Design a protein around this ligand. Structure first.
Ligand code: HEM
Ligand code: HEM
Ligand SMILES: Cc1cc(N)nc(CCc2cncc(CCc3cc(C)cc(N)n3)c2)c1
Ligand SMILES: Cc1cc(N)nc(CCc2cncc(CCc3cc(C)cc(N)n3)c2)c1
Ligand SMILES: C[C@H](O)[C@H](O)[C@H]1CNc2nc(N)[nH]c(=O)c2N1
Ligand SMILES: C[C@H](O)[C@H](O)[C@H]1CNc2nc(N)[nH]c(=O)c2N1
Ligand SMILES: [Zn+2]
Lengths: 402, 404
């Protein structure tokens, strides 16, 4: 019934009672488990809405109370006649905060408290959209002292199409299908960089060409928006001892800002709702820089480091992975830019567990994404049992708009 | 699309559908509401169908399926059970049965080698001295002077009321963990309880950091004898780092043979309460879990000191560097001792082959991602980008209670 979740490094044993709050079901069944997998009426909305409203006022003192009284009524009315309602600004600030907290893949959750919710539900043109982006980005970068934030664009309509950001991050490097099967720059970004060309933009042949923004208002042809260079803040990557590293001319950006997700709240749905925290050095070091399907620079730096590619058993792959990571870490502390090493980050998540285990008795987590891509067993999380289940409001993946 | 689960490989873009799981006549702990994939652990009428099952499988391996040899051996197992509530496997199907459970084990990257497991029936066994000798033979054979061969030895099954056979020791080789009375431990803290249980039995403990535990062996009911192992028979490997000189000075060593001994092999309903299996090590096992887990031997702290590293802060990345070096140290010393070993990249590359095989053969391979993917260099290995499906199949290894 209620699950025993033990930490193995410390013999400590808890129970998750928070699961029962999950409405939405996942992939696992009694027969076989699919934890590893990356992805997947009228009156019914009134119930999601409802259950979100109880959540809300229990959040503030006013639980099951006296404005919780008639507020549950404005909704009664507004779906009753028009089959969809709108959120009060305070209520939306709650939904964002909550939905991050609710996301079992996010190791940066200790922070869910502090978050800046820009409101754009008054956005009509894609022009206005752009402005909001630059402003989200300005507030969020904060000259290098990064601040977690989420601009929220209009909630999709029963009738019409959607506001959608086509980009899968506000900042990104172009990916350029050369002529020889070859790829120049970020390969995870080819199919997309093609769409900007297709919607008529001047490309480069740069490794770290920052891409422009393709924003789309409902039932309208996507518009392109070249992003004022000054907002995108990037870091050259050097190395505390290897003199030769910055020869390589590797750079990364500061702001990780997801844009292709779907903010689901109180039953309503936000197709654009970009959000941006701050990076964990391994995202930049290990995946971003080393994934084969990406920039894939492991071998390069390994040869530099005069190591031995010839065989796997010389650990050359692990040896480089650690410098590159170590390089990524340095760089930010050099350039006065917020960064979080895996160790430091997982330690605090550990905290967040307990911390929530208190507040709400449990907390959903996707172990495989919670544990770092290098040196896993060397973080605590690796030794902590986790329980993963779906909790509204939360972020949800959505099919690309083309 | 198919009525089965889609399995993508995010590095190569490839897909396959796992249809083996259709045959999981056993339940796991994940349910549509919540997933418990991370949790380390979560006979009258039935005993028939379980064998009914296993036999079908047998007669498939031989591809003499549906035939009269089939139905005759089917009409024989009932004969026997129907009359006595139990049956015995022919020796040929024990050999099959054993390999199938290994092949089935969702947590073993080793499985590329599944068909090369070499089985010693010891179902004739009856005392405990007997147990110890059979076991020696095993080690003897399987160590094979460092050029190591996978092997299992099977001891007589469970019964209606009649003491199980049981090996108390978890592996056939695990170093003593002596609790100092200053709070700490000396040696492997994994094995405290067992080291305790051995002095409590008349072994006189040593006082080093790497003393090989004596072997605790139970026969049916007769409360368990305590046997020691011939020092020449337990191939140890002392550890040096190839470039860094002072490592050998750390006094670290490891044993060659990883011999799981406390598990249960289950086939056709029948339960084999003591039936240990050995393979060979994968660098990380030793060089990350064993030597570095804070719960364990925990050397990371000292090694970084020796590496002149800044341990005051984590942004220095000392854990990772020290770990990499310790592993490089594990691989070098086995390599140089001419003692079978396998690096993590090389272990996974090969799991990925096994998956491509098992797809052709059974249509699916069950796996614990959290357990398949190595404890360092996670993503650096192909498996990491491999969606997997976990599920229970029989024959199977089960975890079992500590006997006390
Ligand atoms: C502030 C410090 C933060 C840290 C250290 C952090 C770190 C991370 C990391 C490392 C991941 C895994 C990414 C991956 O495996 O590729 C992640 C996932 C995620 N985080 Fe954060 N993040 C932070 C801020 C935020 C914020 C502010 C939000 C919400 C607005 C957020 C929401 C998410 C979501 C929704 C995912 C999973 C998304 C997906 O699977 O696409 N994170 N976080
Ligand atoms: C060929 C050399 C082998 C290698 C390199 C290898 C590797 C591994 C590894 C790394 C684990 C996970 C250990 C952990 O993380 O705690 C494992 C688990 C396991 N292995 Fe192997 N293995 C090998 C041979 C075998 C053999 C010969 C058997 C039995 C015939 C076997 C059966 C199992 C089983 C049943 C488990 C899971 C049981 C449990 O949950 O503890 N493996 N193997
Ligand atoms: C293309 C794609 C497909 C897919 N199925 N999932 C994803 C999400 C995984 C993913 C990939 N790149 C980047 C991220 C960013 C995660 C992230 C988000 C925030 C807010 C902060 C931070 N440090 N990190 C996440 C991306
Ligand atoms: C509570 C618990 C449950 C469980 N299923 N396994 C364990 C033990 C985990 C464990 C620890 N050290 C060692 C092993 C066996 C590793 C192992 C076994 C074999 C046969 C080959 C090889 N290379 N490696 C397993 C504990
Ligand atoms: C196949 C596997 O589920 C997939 O590659 C996951 C594994 N672990 C991960 N871990 C983190 N931290 N981030 C990820 O994107 C992933 N991806
Ligand atoms: C909490 C976590 O599941 C636990 O530490 C698991 C994680 N992955 C593992 N993976 C392997 N191969 N072996 C283990 O013992 C563990 N331990
Ligand atoms: Zn599951």
């Amino acid at each position: 019934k209620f699950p025993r979740v033990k930490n193995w490094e410390l013999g400590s044993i808890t129970y998750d009672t928070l699961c029962a709050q999950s409405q939405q079901d996942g992939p696992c069944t009694p027969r076989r488990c699919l934890g590893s997998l990356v992805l997947p009426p009228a009156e019914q909305l009134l119930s999601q809405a409802r259950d979100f409203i109880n959540q809300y006022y229990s959040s503030i003192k006013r639980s099951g109370s006296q404005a919780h009284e008639e507020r549950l009524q404005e909704v009664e009315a507004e779906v009753a006649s028009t089959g969809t309602y709108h959120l009060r600004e305070s209520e939306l600030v709650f939904g964002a905060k909550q939905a991050w907290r609710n996301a079992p893949r996010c190791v940066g959750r200790i922070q869910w408290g502090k978050l800046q919710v820009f409101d754009a539900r008054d956005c009509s043109s894609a022009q206005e959209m752009f402005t909001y982006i630059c402003n989200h980005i300005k507030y969020a970068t904060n000259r290098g002292n990064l601040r977690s934030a989420i601009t929220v664009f209009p909630q999709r309509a029963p009738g019409r199409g959607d506001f959608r950001i086509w980009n899968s991050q506000l900042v990104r490097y172009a990916g350029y299908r050369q002529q020889d099967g070859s790829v120049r720059g970020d390969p995870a970004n080819v199919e997309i960089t093609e769409l900007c060309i297709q919607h008529g933009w001047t490309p480069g042949n740069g490794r770290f060409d920052v891409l422009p923004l393709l924003l789309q208002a409902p039932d309208e042809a996507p518009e392109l928006f070249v992003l004022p260079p000054e907002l995108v803040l990037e870091v050259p990557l050097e190395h505390p001892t290897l003199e030769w590293f910055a020869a390589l001319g590797l750079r990364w950006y500061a702001l990780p800002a997801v844009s292709n997700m779907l903010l689901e709240i109180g039953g309503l749905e936000f197709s654009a709702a970009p959000f941006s925290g701050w990076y964990m050095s391994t995202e930049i070091g290990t995946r971003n820089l080393c994934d084969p399907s990406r920039y894939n620079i492991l071998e390069d730096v390994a040869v530099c480091m005069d190591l031995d590619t010839r065989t796997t058993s010389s650990l050359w792959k692990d040896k480089a992975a650690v410098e590159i990571n170590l390089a990524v870490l340095h760089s930010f502390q050099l350039a006065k830019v917020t960064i979080v090493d895996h160790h430091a980050a997982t330690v605090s998540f550990m905290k967040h567990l307990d911390n929530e285990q208190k507040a709400r008795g449990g907390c959903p987590a996707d172990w495989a994404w919670i544990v770092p891509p290098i040196s896993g067993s060397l973080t605590p999380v690796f030794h902590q049992e986790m329980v993963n289940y779906i909790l509204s409001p939360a972020f949800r993946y959505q099919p690309d708009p083309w």
